[model samples]
Target: MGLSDGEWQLVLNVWGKVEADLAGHGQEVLIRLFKGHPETLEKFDKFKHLKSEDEMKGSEDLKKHGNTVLTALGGILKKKGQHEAELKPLAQSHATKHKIPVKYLEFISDAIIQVLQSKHPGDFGADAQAAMKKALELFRNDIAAKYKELGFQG
Candidate 1:
């Protein structure tokens, strides 16, 4: 099954933190993202062991994996923006296929944001707090609408 409205909202909050951190300042998006999605952190810790393995040792692989995850997330966010409520099942599929811990989603979200910042330095700004707030509001409206259409509350 997909996440509930509350669950998705939690994802949004995590994303907001990610965006904010990318914007810059002392804010650590990873910390906030972990707080919002504790399950994601657990999953990430489990996966962390694989980082030192031969196949995943390089930072290049880390960057690649991070990009893959972010692309997936951004696609879902876009779908949510386009009034597609059924797309949430895609997230559930990923979690299931990867055996992701229910609590590590936030960590994954935070990692993706970090990767993005590292890859695209100039894409973000110094005033990330305000920018993130606005971006999050836009994201929330669309996601909330999707939940509403599915007969749920967020």
Candidate 2:
């Protein structure tokens, strides 16, 4: 099931920030991930050679992919329940075709939250955080089965 009425309200509240900085914070989110989870970058051939976060920030490939990711996620969030079923397929595609570890995908959730929090200090109250939890869990749960079938440990 999708989020409850109040929960969906919280989702929109927090997601509004994501929509605002889709480009800036979107890139920032990925940069944070690559910095903290360097090993996770191994799967992406284009980014595997980046020596530092500066190089990643300057990467054209990062711009291309990061925008694409956030755009797609924006669509999903916009559609909300209408897109819930599609989440499973999207997650499966990430695992099977993108070769991104499910763990890394999950890790991106935290990255998004951190980026959002950084962007708006003292704005992320319990309601927003709880909504973030439910939203991320919604996607991860959809991913879990196919991710397991693919032998994804993370």
Candidate 3:
């Protein structure tokens, strides 16, 4: 089932607070992802030599990348699970063009969840976390559904 109105309220509310810091937080997320899953970095033609900490806090390119990722994530939250129009294109790009698997998306979500809890501890409690999980579950299901149509399975 989709997230209820109450659950979406929590999501949208914190997202504004969360969106403000995503440029930095999202960079940390990417750094963590590359470190934990080095293969993920190969896809990026950008700097890969720097360690996670340096790239996250200092690099200009990484900062832009972080902002891009955060913007994409923010748009998803903005849709409030009511707009599949925004979602399908994103899912298609990730699934077919980017060839990103659901696992990688999950990893990013994990980082986002961590950032949310750390940045806004008061707001990102169990209820918010559960709501985020449900949203991501739908995201994965949608992306995977499209992937299957393309004969892509993972």
Alpha-carbon local distance difference test for all models: 0.43, 0.74, 0.75
- Please write out the lDDT profile of model 1 over residues 57-136, one tens digit for every residue: 33443445454544455555534344345345533343344444322433444444564465445554444323433443
Lowest lDDT 10-residue stretch of candidate 3: 48-57
Decide which is better by lDDT, 1 or 2.
Answer: 2
> Which 10 consecutive positions of candidate 2 have the poorest summed lDDT?
49-58
Off by over 4 Å in 3: 52-56
User: Per-residue alpha-carbon lDDT of model 2 for 36-98, expressed as tens digits?
Assistant: 787778777778765544577767888887887888877776665566466667766777657
TM-scores of the candidates are 0.39, 0.84, 0.84
Better of 2 and 3 by lDDT: 3
